[PDB]
Amino acid sequence: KMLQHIDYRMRCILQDGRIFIGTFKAFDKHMNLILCDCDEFRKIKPKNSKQAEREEKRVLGLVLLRGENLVSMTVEGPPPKD
Amino acid sequence: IGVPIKVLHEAEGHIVTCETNTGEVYRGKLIEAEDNMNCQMSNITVTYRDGRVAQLEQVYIRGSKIRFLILPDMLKNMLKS
Amino acid sequence: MKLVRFLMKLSHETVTIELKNGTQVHGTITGVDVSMNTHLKAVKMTLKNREPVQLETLSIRGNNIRYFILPDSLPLDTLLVD
Amino acid sequence: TKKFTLMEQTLPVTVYEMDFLADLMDNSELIRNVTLCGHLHHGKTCFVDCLIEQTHPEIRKRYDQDLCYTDILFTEQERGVGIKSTPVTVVLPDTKGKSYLFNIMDTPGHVNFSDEVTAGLRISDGVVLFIDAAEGVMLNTERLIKHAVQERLAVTVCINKIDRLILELKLPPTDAYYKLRHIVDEVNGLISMYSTDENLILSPLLGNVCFSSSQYSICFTLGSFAKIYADTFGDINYQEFAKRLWGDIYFNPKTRKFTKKAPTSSSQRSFVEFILEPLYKILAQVVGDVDTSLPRTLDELGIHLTKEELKLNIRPLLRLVCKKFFGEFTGFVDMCVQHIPSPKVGAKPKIEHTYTGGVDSDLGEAMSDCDPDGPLMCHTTKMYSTDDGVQFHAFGRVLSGTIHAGQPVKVLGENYTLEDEEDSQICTVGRLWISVARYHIEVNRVPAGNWVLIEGVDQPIVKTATITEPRGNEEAQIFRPLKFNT
Amino acid sequence: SLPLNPKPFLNGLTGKPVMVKLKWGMEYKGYLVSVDGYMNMQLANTEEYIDGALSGHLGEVLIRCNNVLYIRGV
Amino acid sequence: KAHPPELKKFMDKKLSLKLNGGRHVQGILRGFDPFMNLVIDECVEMATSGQQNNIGMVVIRGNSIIMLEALERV
Amino acid sequence: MVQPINLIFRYLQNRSRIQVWLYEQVNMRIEGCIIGFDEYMNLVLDDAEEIHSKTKSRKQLGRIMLKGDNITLLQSVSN
Amino acid sequence: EEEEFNTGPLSVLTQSVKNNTQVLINCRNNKKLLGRVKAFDRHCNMVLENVKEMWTEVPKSGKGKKKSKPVNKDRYISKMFLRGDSVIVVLRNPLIA
Amino acid sequence: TYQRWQFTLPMMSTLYRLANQLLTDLVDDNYFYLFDLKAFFTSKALNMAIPGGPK
Amino acid sequence: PNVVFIKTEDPDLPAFYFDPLINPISFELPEFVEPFLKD
Numbered sequence A: 001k002m003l004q005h006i007d008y009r010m011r012c013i014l015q016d017g018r019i020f021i022g023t024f025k026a027f028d029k030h031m032n033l034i035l036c037d038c039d040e041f042r043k044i045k046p047k048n049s050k051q052a053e054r055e056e057k058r059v060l061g062l063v064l065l066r067g068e069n070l071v072s073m074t075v076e077g078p079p080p081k082d
Numbered sequence B: 001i002g003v004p005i006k007v008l009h010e011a012e013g014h015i016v017t018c019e020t021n022t023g024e025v026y027r028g029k030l031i032e033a034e035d036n037m038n039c040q041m042s043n044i045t046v047t048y049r050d051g052r053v054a055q056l057e058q059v060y061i062r063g064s065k066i067r068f069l070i071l072p073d074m075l076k077n078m079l080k081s
Numbered sequence C: 001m002k003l004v005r006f007l008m009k010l011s012h013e014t015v016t017i018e019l020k021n022g023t024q025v026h027g028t029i030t031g032v033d034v035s036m037n038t039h040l041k042a043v044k045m046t047l048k049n050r051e052p053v054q055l056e057t058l059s060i061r062g063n064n065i066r067y068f069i070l071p072d073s074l075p076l077d078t079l080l081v082d
Numbered sequence D: 001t002k003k004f005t006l007m008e009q010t011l012p013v014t015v016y017e018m019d020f021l022a023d024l025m026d027n028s029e030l031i032r033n034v035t036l037c038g039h040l041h042h043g044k045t046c047f048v049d050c051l052i053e054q055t056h057p058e059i060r061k062r063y064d065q066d067l068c069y070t071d072i073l074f075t076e077q078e079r080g081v082g083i084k085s086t087p088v089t090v091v092l093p094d095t096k097g098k099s100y101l102f103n104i105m106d107t108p109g110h111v112n113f114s115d116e117v118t119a120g121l122r123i124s125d126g127v128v129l130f131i132d133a134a135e136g137v138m139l140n141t142e143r144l145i146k147h148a149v150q151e152r153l154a155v156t157v158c159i160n161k162i163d164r165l166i167l168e169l170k171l172p173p174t175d176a177y178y179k180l181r182h183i184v185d186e187v188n189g190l191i192s193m194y195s196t197d198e199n200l201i202l203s204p205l206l207g208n209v210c211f212s213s214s215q216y217s218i219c220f221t222l223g224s225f226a227k228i229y230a231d232t233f234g235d236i237n238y239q240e241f242a243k244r245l246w247g248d249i250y251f252n253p254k255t256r257k258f259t260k261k262a263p264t265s266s267s268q269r270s271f272v273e274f275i276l277e278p279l280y281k282i283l284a285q286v287v288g289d290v291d292t293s294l295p296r297t298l299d300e301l302g303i304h305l306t307k308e309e310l311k312l313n314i315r316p317l318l319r320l321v322c323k324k325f326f327g328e329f330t331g332f333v334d335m336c337v338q339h340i341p342s343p344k345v346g347a348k349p350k351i352e353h354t355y356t357g358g359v360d361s362d363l364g365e366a367m368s369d370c371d372p373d374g375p376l377m378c379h380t381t382k383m384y385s386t387d388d389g390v391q392f393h394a395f396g397r398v399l400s401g402t403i404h405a406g407q408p409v410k411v412l413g414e415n416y417t418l419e420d421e422e423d424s425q426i427c428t429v430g431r432l433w434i435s436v437a438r439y440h441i442e443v444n445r446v447p448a449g450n451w452v453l454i455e456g457v458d459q460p461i462v463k464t465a466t467i468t469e470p471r472g473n474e475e476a477q478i479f480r481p482l483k484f485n486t
Numbered sequence E: 001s002l003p004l005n006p007k008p009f010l011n012g013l014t015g016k017p018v019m020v021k022l023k024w025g026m027e028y029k030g031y032l033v034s035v036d037g038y039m040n041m042q043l044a045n046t047e048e049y050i051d052g053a054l055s056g057h058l059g060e061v062l063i064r065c066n067n068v069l070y071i072r073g074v
Numbered sequence F: 001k002a003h004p005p006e007l008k009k010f011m012d013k014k015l016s017l018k019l020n021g022g023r024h025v026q027g028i029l030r031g032f033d034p035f036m037n038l039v040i041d042e043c044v045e046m047a048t049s050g051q052q053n054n055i056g057m058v059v060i061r062g063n064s065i066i067m068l069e070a071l072e073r074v
Numbered sequence G: 001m002v003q004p005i006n007l008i009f010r011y012l013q014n015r016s017r018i019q020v021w022l023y024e025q026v027n028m029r030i031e032g033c034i035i036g037f038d039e040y041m042n043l044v045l046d047d048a049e050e051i052h053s054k055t056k057s058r059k060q061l062g063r064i065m066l067k068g069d070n071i072t073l074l075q076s077v078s079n
Numbered sequence H: 001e002e003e004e005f006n007t008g009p010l011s012v013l014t015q016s017v018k019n020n021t022q023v024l025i026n027c028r029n030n031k032k033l034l035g036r037v038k039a040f041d042r043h044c045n046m047v048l049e050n051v052k053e054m055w056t057e058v059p060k061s062g063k064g065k066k067k068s069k070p071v072n073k074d075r076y077i078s079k080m081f082l083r084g085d086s087v088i089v090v091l092r093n094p095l096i097a
Numbered sequence I: 001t002y003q004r005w006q007f008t009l010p011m012m013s014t015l016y017r018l019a020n021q022l023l024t025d026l027v028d029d030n031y032f033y034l035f036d037l038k039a040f041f042t043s044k045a046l047n048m049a050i051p052g053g054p055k
Numbered sequence J: 001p002n003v004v005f006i007k008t009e010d011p012d013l014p015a016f017y018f019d020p021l022i023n024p025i026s027f028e029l030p031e032f033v034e035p036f037l038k039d
């Protein structure tokens, strides 16, 4: 169930309510996550919001997130080929 | 021992960024990373929740009270997993 | 006895789950594991004070669950047998 | 087509990635520059061979004769002896699992070629001194200790060929302990003869002594063998168990604690009872009881071998069993990480001894910082022929700055001084390679603190050279020329 | 007293009137029927004091261990 | 496992301790255990008012330790 | 080196009056004489008090067993 | 272990399952769940039947000027699973009586 | 077909003991210092004769 | 390099033996752990 989504782009929700979107490359027992090319969003997860899709976006890069602070994950997009 | 943990130990000696559970942001050289995510760092820049910065020579943060870490992008590019 | 075992039997059921952070999740269980980490499909998820979003897949860290609302039909006495 | 070396074009598979090597090469605080030295035939090339085998998954030994991967000449392969020093650049993990960039110079052990050792000493930060466990401390061992101490390097020791104690001399394990202790004492005596006040004591308790067997691929420190015990049994602490495994300490199995007083008269020291005794038991079960009770012993160690592996003859089988038991050579890497300084922290006593202009200057402080953006100062002590033999490529380390392919540089010879300016040359560098024994990785730029093969500068270089930038640096001085043992 | 530990103290207090403060500031007075290894607590004839004032008379009650701040005999 | 925190380097050094609740104290490290519980000597509470008050030798539970910073060079 | 548990064992033996900082509650702290304690840092306090830092008011408790969950910090007081 | 479920504080749950009796669960969410215990475990996870969930709310400044008056609420849930960490208190009092 | 054999180690030690009259007592190679094939090849090429060796 | 291999004439000696041809030289652990291959 985790290994399936590996290499995919994933939308992860934090306990404070942040949205981390990155390439899901690794996990573990605690659900500590490894996210490549990761950005953070605060205001929205866009479903094509006609005004704009992106406000308070930050480029982070290579991120290790601790599982304590993870709430949930959904598939955001397919794996980048690279 | 977890796959992410091995990758963390790999970042020892590199410049990393750390956010705590309270949202203070510490950037500097990772000296030592323990199995439980306890982190010794040096020559830090800290950016508080109000936006202000400070400078510290030496710090050590408990693993539990870390929200996340940013590691070097180059280091990431594990494959076997 | 170990009630997570009971939840692990509920693949392919549709449920509503209330989260610790107030979020409400309605979807079809693809898998519950030993940590109560729950995976779903065809998910309509309503964060507290939003309109629902639909996700093809969603994965919940077990600890973040408050409670599951089960199908009225569910034959509990069957499922409680080991 | 004249072909004098075993060098190839095809770049073989590695376990690491190549851009990860360029990453580590940029990082400049993980890398270490080591010279392997020893007496003739004490096992240096078969050790490097062991490491290469571990790193490159498909390059293997031929079951009956060894590849000497680092001997790349038809003369060294025929004549059987190391003639010319050869650089390797690999990426290795430690016991933690953190990889490092090792630049290893494999030097010849014959005493007549000791000048090649001095060339390898100029370009490197530490030295690993190999000693035959059966033969002891020999002529060139003493000479190279004296030479390494006087050239201001860190020294770590590896005691190779421990199978000679079990499989040739057949000593009882206690007398094996006594002979190894004799060797480490004699090295300490030689250092304290030559070195000053500086506590360069070596002991395996201090973690700068390595016990290996490069034929059967055994290598351990006290730390890594402790870690094998910790990996078999979960709650062992690594370091604390490591600090009790040498010396006159003993073990009390009712107390479960290490005593410095012997519990009975007939008891065994901790090293003998925890390290040598299973080693004597592994080799004896393999060479004596491959048919009867090697399966039971391989089960008890947890090692699994296939049906075709058990059909090997005894020497390949033993090498295989020991590769499965000891794994990667992380104890060596720990020894070299802990005790060989990096280029940054090691740059200061290098520029003291090495640079003619003096230690403190604009160039001196610039070098001492070892930053890769400063003035280019590169120093070449070695020159390598091509496979045909027509043209040469210089081999040096970069002390400051960064070299780029195509860029022009000024080359300064030994007889150059600042005020005469007469002995100098301007040349454009063609290509750059990160040299490896049988193949070269071609790069575009090489940062400070790293070894490099340079095309194009050879024509003004008589013996050794320094390389700096054409515009600016009117204050550059040439590094002192090599001072030989003989 | 010569060392009086958590566990015996609580065991001595079984059969007795107690009040438990919870981390959240609620208070529960009643007869301590039992405690277990994790320091979960069972009261009888429980009463609830919130803001230190009698709120509700509740009867038999289980308190999950993680909620407990402290226990007092009373 | 049951690991020690790597704090021997910080032994007998003056430190600045950030605790939960926005609380901050300063003192000399006198010891620790595997839970990261600390002994701090000559400890001083840095009140949010800015005022500082001497509390002597104290125990800090590792649970509530957010961060420490050395006021010395290690 | 002094180990934290031992410090407590000292507090116990001394019968020094102790003031405890609680977790995520600053406006109240607890006081008392440690009579005994356990592996979880759960404490048995005698003649214990709730101390309101805001109200300067003290609430009298007597025999207290404080769960260790709440312990942020342990200090001694002369009183 | 059964002995500790049988006689310890969790006997409250053990007794409720055996007698099919109602219990009120004060809950972390500030809600209360009133019903019958079909199953329970160490953590106080439970499978509950005929659950009446009760709570309280406010209009939360419906005016726009910070004016509201508290409101009680309830809802029926026939079948549900409660993760035990949310438990504050479990009451084996005579709610029916 | 009688094409491949594999023996146990007591078999090999018995055979090794029984064959020792025909076998050498050298353990290493240094006995053949200037008596190996390569020495004989060089000697032939230079027209020189090692004292025991062929001409 | 010289093979210093030592022949044994008599089988009643131990395999690991100091032959007179050789020139003479001159924290708690768990209860479960043992040396490797103690049996």
Ligand SMILES: Nc1nc2c(ncn2[C@@H]2O[C@H](COP(=O)(O)OP(=O)(O)OP(=O)(O)O)[C@@H](O)[C@H]2O)c(=O)[nH]1
Binding pocket: D039, D040, D041, D042, D043, D044, D045, D046, D047, D066, D068, D080, D081, D082, D083, D107, D108, D109, D110, D160, D161, D162, D163, D164, D212, D213, D214, D215, D216, J001
């Ligand atoms: N018995 C034994 N022999 C070994 C071992 N390792 C290497 N040898 C042999 O020792 C001889 C040394 O060969 P090398 O390892 O290439 O020698 P070297 O260390 O490179 O020495 P140089 O020729 O000076 O360069 C070879 O015969 C190896 O087969 C060992 O672990 N045990």
Ligand SMILES: [Mg+2]
Binding pocket: D044, D045, D046, D081, D082, D106, D107, D108, D109
């Ligand atoms: Mg060699």
